[PDB]
Amino acid sequence: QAVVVGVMAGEGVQIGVLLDANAPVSVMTDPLL
């Protein structure tokens, strides 16, 4: 299971990323950054 979302970044630049469905945000916010 997974999900894809539009992550907004610097000056509002739109970026697309794929994230796990069940893992908590705390374990993914580091590699995502």
Added chain:
Amino acid sequence: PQAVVVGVMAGEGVQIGVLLDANAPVSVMTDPLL
């Protein structure tokens, strides 16, 4: 300077305070705001 706080008016009269992204274009925010 990355964000600004504003009060948004919604249906029939409820006012809600929100902190918006100061540089993304408004059209990108209207959907999640609703």
